[PDB]
């Protein structure tokens, strides 16, 4: 599992002006549904297709000269999701992203109801950033099918913002949504799929 270097919040707030700060939110909810009436979904997590053709979480870069990290996140969420407000109680972690640029990525996470999660999807299609910076929301499939690739392994084989993919797996583990043994398994199947597909071409 790829891991970024963690930094405490107070120490991230001491980083100099040469650092850019990004805030993104992982919204998820318990899902009692069953795909095909036989595959429990367990949880749904929201990600999005970005303008640059990569998957990531809602959010973006924030200005924290005169605003908190939560106020900046809510600004980029109001444009990207049009949803309600997150608070400091939703803050999960901060990471130093892979270079070359100096960026510290803050991750927030809140468990909603499935109804509230769908309401975020409805608001997102009506948001200002829909069609411009955000090209659509996608739910993360956490199930795996009998073929051992369908679902979560296939999903991890897409193209991500490297920070977001690390944040997704880090959150699924520490929020007790997926056993770490299952994440390494799915990530291994995804890489294997990427190997074969690339060996052919």
């Amino acid at each position: 599992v790829p891991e970024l270097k963690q930094i405490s919040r107070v120490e991230a707030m001491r980083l100099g002006p040469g650092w850019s700060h990004s805030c993104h939110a992982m919204l998820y909810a318990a899902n009692p549904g069953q795909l095909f009436g036989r595959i429990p979904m367990r949880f749904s997590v929201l990600m999005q297709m970005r303008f640059d053709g990569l998957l990531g979480f809602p959010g973006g870069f924030v200005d924290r000269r005169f605003w908190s990290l939560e106020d900046g996140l809510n600004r980029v969420l109001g444009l990207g999701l049009g949803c309600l407000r997150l608070t400091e109680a939703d803050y999960l972690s901060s990471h130093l992203t892979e270079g070359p640029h100096r960026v510290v990525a803050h991750l927030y996470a809140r468990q909603l109801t499935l109804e509230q999660l769908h309401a975020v999807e409805i608001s997102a299609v009506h948001s200002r950033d829909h069609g411009l910076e955000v090209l659509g929301l996608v739910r993360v499939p956490l199930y795996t099918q009998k073929d051992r690739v369908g679902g979560f392994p296939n999903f991890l084989s897409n193209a991500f913002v490297s920070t977001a993919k690390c944040q997704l797996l880090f959150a699924l583990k520490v929020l007790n949504m997926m056993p770490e043994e299952k994440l390494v398994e799915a990530l291994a199947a995804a890489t294997e799929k990427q190997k074969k597909a690339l060996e052919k071409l």
């Binding site: 980083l15 040469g18 270079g99 070359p100």
Partner: protein
């Protein structure tokens, strides 16, 4: 034998980029407290530290051009003004001046300096 106060180019991760900074404390056991020019402060092992200031001429580096994108270049000159160091980086036959913090090394570019300037 004290490294405190010396300018270095170091990486704060085992596989990351090398950034300019200074050594602040000798944490011991081959470990050093390093304050990077960007304000980041953390403990770094000697093997991750390059004791070289400025970056030598003809070294291949990774520079921030136009304040948006990084790309590879070659050092061709140094110049200090009002205490700030400027690097002359040549990219595809064109030279420009870059601030110190706009000049970094990739993992491969820095690892190639470990035997000449490394601290471990």
């Amino acid at each position: 034998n004290s490294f405190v106060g010396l300018r270095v180019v170091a990486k704060w991760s085992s596989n990351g980029y090398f950034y300019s900074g200074k050594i602040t404390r000798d944490v011991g056991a081959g470990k050093y407290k390093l304050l990077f020019d960007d304000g980041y402060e953390c403990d770094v092992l000697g093997k991750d530290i390059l004791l070289c200031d400025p970056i030598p001429l003809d070294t291949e580096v990774t520079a921030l051009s136009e304040d948006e994108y990084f790309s590879a270049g070659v050092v061709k000159g140094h110049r200090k003004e009002s205490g700030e160091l400027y690097y002359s980086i040549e990219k595809e036959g064109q030279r420009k001046w870059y601030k110190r913090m706009a000049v970094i090394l990739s993992l491969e570019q820095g690892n190639r300096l470990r035997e000449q300037y490394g601290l471990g």
